[PDB]
Design a protein around this ligand. Structure first.
Ligand SMILES: OC[C@H]1O[C@@H](O[C@H]2[C@H](O)[C@H](O)[C@H](O)O[C@@H]2CO)[C@@H](O)[C@@H](O)[C@@H]1O
Ligand code: NA
Length: 367
C-alpha cells in the first residue's frame, strides 16, 4: 500500500519497500552501524561483526556513513575505507540484508566537520553562492553508488537498494544544517534539492528516502508539530524516521526509567500515526545506550516498550549506532555488545525474540 516517491524505482527497491510494509506489523528488523568495518576490540577482518560474534547472526540492517566522501577522501570521518565499504555493502546485500546510509557532511564554508556550526545551508541551496558545491558533493555519492553496481548476463545493471537518510537530526542545533544555523525554509529547500538532484537529475533509482528528526528536541506535549519542523513534504520522504537516544537512558535525561519507557512507546506510537496518515513506513533510525551500562537494556528498555503498544510496534526496523574501535579511537563508544560485555546475554534474548529479525531469518526482501 505505501508507494515510493521514486515511481520508477528498481524492482529490488520497490520490493524492499513493499516487504518492509508487510513485515512491520509482526516483526522488527535489527540494524547496526559500521557493523562489518570494525568492533570495539578488533579491526581488519574482512568478514566479522561484534553482533555476529555475540549472537551467531549478522544484523538485518547495515548502516554506513559517507562523511568525507564529498571531500574526495579515501576513507570516511571514522576511517572506514570507502572501497572496503562498497565491498561490505555488496556482501551484506548479497546475503539478503538491508542497507542504510547517513552522511555527516563536512562544513563547506570552514572546511570543518558537521559539528562546526558555521552557516552554510543558505549558501548551498539553489540560488546560493555555493550551490555548485552542493552539486559536487552529491556527485560523489552518485559515483560511490556506481561502485555498488553489478551487471547481469543480459547486460542489465543492478544495485543494492539504499535507505538514504541525509541531513538528520535537523531539529537539533548541533549540526550546521540544524536549527539556529539554517532557516526552516532553507532546510526544506536543501532537502527538496537533494531529492530532485539524485532522483530526477541524476536518475538514481535504488534509493528510499528517510527523514529523521531527533526526539530529544521534540516536545512530547506537541509531538507532531515538533516532528514536522523542517518537513519537506510527502513527495520527498519515504521513511518517517526518528533518532531517539533520549528515552533509552541518555546521560543528560533526568526522567525516571519508567518515565523513559513510557516516552519511548509514546514517541514511536505517534511516529507510526504520522506515517500512517502519510501512507509511509516508520522506523527507529538511530538509538541505543552508549557503553551498554543498563541491565537488560535490550529486552527491558528497547523491545519491551516497542512491543507494549500495537502502534509503536508497527515500526519496520530499529538501528543502533557504531561499536567504535578502542585501540584506535581512545574512548569507549559502542551500542551493540561484544563477547563478554554485560548485556551480551540480554542481547541474545533480543535476537531470540520471535518479533526481532536479524539477517539469518529475513524473508527474501528483494522480490
Ligand atoms: O559516525 C559519525 C559520528 O557519529 C557520532 O555518533 C552520533 C551521530 O553523530 C548521530 O548523532 C547519531 O545518530 O548519534 C550518534 C551517537 O551519539 C559519533 O559516533 C562520532 O564518533 C562519529 O564520528
Ligand atoms: Na528473532
Amino acid at each position: 500500500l505505501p508507494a515510493l516517491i521514486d515511481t520508477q524505482a528498481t524492482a529490488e527497491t520497490r520490493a524492499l519497500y513493499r516487504n518492509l510494509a508487510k513485515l512491520r506489523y509482526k516483526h522488527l528488523l535489527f540494524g547496526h552501524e559500521d557493523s562489518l568495518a570494525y568492533g570495539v576490540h578488533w579491526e581488519g577482518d574482512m568478514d566479522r561483526s561484534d553482533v555476529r560474534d555475540v549472537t551467531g547472526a549478522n544484523p538485518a540492517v547495515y548502516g554506513w556513513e559517507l562523511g568525507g566522501l564529498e571531500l574526495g577522501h579515501t576513507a570516511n570521518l571514522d576511517a572506514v575505507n570507502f572501497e572496503k565499504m562498497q565491498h561490505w555493502i555488496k556482501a551484506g546485500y548479497s546475503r539478503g540484508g538491508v542497507i542504510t546510509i547517513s552522511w555527516h557532511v563536512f562544513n563547506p564554508v570552514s572546511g570543518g566537520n558537521s559539528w562546526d556550526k558555521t552557516p552554510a545551508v543558505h549558501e548551498l541551496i539553489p540560488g546560493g553562492a555555493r550551490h555548485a558545491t552542493l552539486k559536487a558533493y552529491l556527485d560523489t555519492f552518485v559515483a560511490f553508488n556506481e561502485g555498488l553496481a553489478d551487471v547481469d548476463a543480459q547486460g542489465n545493471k543492478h544495485y543494492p537498494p539504499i535507505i538514504f537518510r541525509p541531513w538528520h537530526e535537523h531539529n537539533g542545533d548541533w549540526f550546521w544544517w540544524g536549527k539556529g544555523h539554517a532557516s526552516e525554509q532553507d532546510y526544506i529547500a536543501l532537502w527538496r534539492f537533494t531529492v530532485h538532484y539524485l532522483r530526477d537529475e541524476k536518475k538514481l533509482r535504488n534509493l528510499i528516502y528517510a527523514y529523521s528528526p531527533d526526539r530529544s528536541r521534540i516536545d512530547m506535549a506537541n509531538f507532531e508539530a515538533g516532528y514536522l519542523y523542517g518537513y519537506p513534504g510527502d513527495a520527498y520522504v519515504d521513511i518517517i524516521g526518528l533518532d531517539n537516544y533520549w528515552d533509552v537512558g541518555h546521560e543528560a535525561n533526568t526522567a525516571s526509567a519508567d518515565e523513559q519507557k513510557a516516552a519511548l512507546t509514546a514517541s514511536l506510537k505517534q511516529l507510526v500515526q504520522i506515517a500512517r496518515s502519510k501512507g509511509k513506513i516508520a522506523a527507529l533510525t538511530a538509538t541505543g545506550n552508549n557503553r551498554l551500562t543498563i541491565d537488560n537494556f535490550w529486552t527491558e528498555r528497547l523491545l519491551g516498550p516497542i512491543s507494549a503498544d500495537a502502534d509503536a510496534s508497527e515500526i519496520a526496523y530499529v538501528m543502533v549506532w557504531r561499536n567504535a574501535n578502542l585501540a584506535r579511537e581512545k574512548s569507549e563508544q559502542f551500542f551493540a555488545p561484544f563477547p563478554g560485555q554485560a548485556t551480551a546475554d540480554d542481547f541474545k534474548r533480543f535476537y531470540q525474540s520471535e518479533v526481532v529479525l536479524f539477517e539469518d531469518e529475513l524473508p527474501p526482501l528483494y522480490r
